[model samples]
Target: MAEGGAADLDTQRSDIATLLKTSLRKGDTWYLVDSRWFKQWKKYVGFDSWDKYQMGDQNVYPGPIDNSGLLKDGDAQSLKEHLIDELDYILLPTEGWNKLVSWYTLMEGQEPIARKVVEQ
Candidate 1:
């Protein structure tokens, strides 16, 4: 998130991978919900008073099968399971767009995007 911070991208990449492999796959997605957007918005567009919100369950956008309802405990577990199953979907040929901007910004020169395993 800072200039030249990208030089140590391996740290971030490894951290994310380790998180997904260990804690995340074990149901910590609720805690690891990406909060950069929330941090940015909090500083810019101050939230309303008494409007309590969190990163995970609060951000569920709903779906066709479970339409128009707040995500409950079951929904959170279901979503996390579905997300884990789709981990490889990011590299699927059918995926029309690549997260190039994300890679460039977060991992420009530190890590290889298409590599099999990261070596320290």
Candidate 2:
């Protein structure tokens, strides 16, 4: 659940905008969710148990994590607008945003920046 009632508009707007801009600068081939995001998401959602339940009796790994469920191509504008309009409905900790930003930073080979964001 969200840690606070709602994030400050300016902060959320700035973070999302920065994320988008950074992502765009990285190019279109780079997806929003990378291996690092999947690893974090698994921990975030307690996916060990969820995976056990969902893959009962299956002998195969889940393969690559698909990000379409979270965000898709051409969804940047819509996602930005959605966050701007409904930030109050967000239920994740503010650190979640920082994690996302860190993920993008990692993808860009900016480990120091990612670590700084995570530390924040």
Candidate 3:
């Protein structure tokens, strides 16, 4: 889900890091980049597509903020772009970059970031 607020992003990232670490094996690594499927889904739905805005179904919404970037009005696409970079630099290293790289290699074409994850 998109985090929505600046404070929320930091908390969410911490929560996400904890979950990822617990979900995977001790040395088994994974990269946030490979989880682009959810990010792609968010762009497909729209940044403010949440219950607070009364725009659409909350169940299908990806929240407002995503990838540690705030989702301000008029710049959703730009936010996505910034968030993508944050994913590469910040979130992806939670499990250690080396382990993440290994996981990325295994996923390879299956979770191609260039395709599944987009700016807008």
Best by TM-score: 2
Task: Please rank every candidate by lDDT, starting with the best.
Answer: 3, 2, 1
Q: How do the residues 5-107 of candidate 2 rate in per-residue lDDT, one tens digit apiece?
A: 4333234334444454452222122223333444444333333444433222223322333333333356521222232111212212234445444333322
Question: What digit string (tens of lDDT, one per residue) describes model 1 on residues 1-120?
Answer: 322522123333333334335422222112212233323222222222233242113243111122112123554332223322222222211111122223222221222122122222
After superposing candidate 1 on the true structure, give the runs of residues whose Cα lies further than 4 Å from its correct spot.
Answer: 1-3, 25-84, 87-120
1-120, model 3: which lDDT tens digit per residue? 443422243233344455545544345333444234334323333422442232233554343223233332554322244444435323343333333333223232233122222224
Runs of candidate 3 exceeding 4 Å displacement: 1-22, 32-38, 45-86, 89-120
Candidate 2 lDDT: 0.33
TM-score leaderboard ranking: 2, 1, 3
Ten-residue stretch with the least lDDT total in model 3: 108-117
Task: Tell me the TM-score of each prediction against the true structure.
Answer: 0.22, 0.23, 0.21
lDDT of 1: 0.25
State the number of backbone clashes in model 1. 0
Error of 1 at 80 (Å): 14
RMSD of each: 16.4, 14.5, 13.6
lDDT score at residue 114, model 2, on the 0-100 scale: 15
